[PDB]
Design a protein around this ligand. Structure first.
Ligand SMILES: Nc1nc2c(ncn2[C@@H]2O[C@H](COP(=O)(O)OP(=O)(O)O)[C@@H](O)[C@H]2O)c(=O)[nH]1
Ligand code: ALF
Ligand SMILES: [K+]
Ligand SMILES: [Mg+2]
Length: 257
């Protein structure tokens, strides 16, 4: 059983796609926060695949307990594949979560949803260019028009932890990359090897939840803290700002193409 997880911002159309894929009639509403818990189902056209509908999430640093459900599912390493549902009308903001999903080490396939609205707004995105610069497969989809749904399930099924070798993580400012490497060595075996980069960046971000979940040694805590301090002076900017800016700068470079 291949495990595919529907991850994306709230109101991106995850349940709409789920319902089409599974034949289900799970709750779909035109406001953020309808889906509040996990729901599994089998892919109608390919019964070997199990797909998970999860609540909308703005980032892997959750604000509400509903956002925690999606995060915990991915970090528990249950999912073989991340089907990242992206709102094409709000691309830049949706990609902020995308950068974090890749970092989890679970291969990401993008469903570039609501392509119909984008067509009605008189705009077009070079799908192949976006896919190449992002390092992940991209299929333009519409849940309304029922466009590209089967194709994106197909690709997600072929982009799992079992079929993908080395992954293409988003590369940031080289000065931050040095800090990430050092934290990766400090971390050693305190985290899964697959998700190591995700945790390393979140520890640099001083994410309270990650810090508590990992329960790192006093020696590890001192060295990370030292790595952050030095990198802050190099960047002449606070740790949270460095990462936030570096994600959006990466997003900027990808979108212009
Ligand atoms: N126009 C258009 N609307 C969509 C599309 N996908 C979903 N929707 C609509 O987007 C809203 C959000 O749907 P939903 O599945 O609840 O989003 P979710 O919170 O990610 O599960 C609903 O009003 C759907 O009718 C799409 O591809 N095109
Ligand atoms: F905002 Al939702 F499922 F209702 F992501
Ligand atoms: K919704
Ligand atoms: Mg939903």
């Amino acid at each position: 059983m291949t495990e595919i997880a529907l991850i994306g911002n709230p109101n991106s159309g995850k349940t709409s796609l789920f319902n089409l894929i599974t034949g289900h009639n799970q709750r779909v509403g035109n406001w953020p926060g309808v889906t509040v818990e996990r729901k599994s189902g089998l892919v109608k056209k390919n019964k070997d695949l199990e797909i998970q509908d999860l609540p909308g999430i703005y980032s892997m640093s959750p604000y509400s307990p509903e956002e925690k459900v999606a995060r915990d599912y991915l970090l528990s390493q249950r999912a073989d594949s991340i089907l990242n549902v992206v709102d094409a009308t709000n691309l830049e903001r949706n990609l902020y979560l995308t950068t974090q999903l890749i970092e989890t080490g679970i291969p990401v396939t993008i469903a570039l949803n609501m392509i119909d609205v984008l067509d009605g707004q008189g705009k077009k995105i070079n799908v192949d260019k976006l896919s190449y610069h992002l390092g992940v497969p991209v299929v333009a989809t519409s849940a309304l028009k029922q466009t590209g749904v089967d194709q994106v399930v197909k690709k997600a099924a072929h982009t799992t932890t079992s079929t993908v070798g080395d992954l293409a993580f988003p590369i940031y400012d080289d000065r931050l990359e040095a800090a990430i490497s050092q934290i990766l060595e400090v971390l050693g075996n305190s985290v899964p090897q697959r998700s190591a980069r995700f945790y390393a960046i979140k520890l640099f971000e001083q994410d309270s939840l990650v810090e508590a979940e990992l329960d790192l040694s006093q020696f590890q805590r001192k060295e990370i803290e030292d790595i952050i301090r030095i990198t802050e002076e190099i960047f002449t900017e606070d740790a949270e700002s460095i990462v936030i800016n570096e994600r959006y700068a990466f997003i900027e470079r990808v979108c212009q193409m």
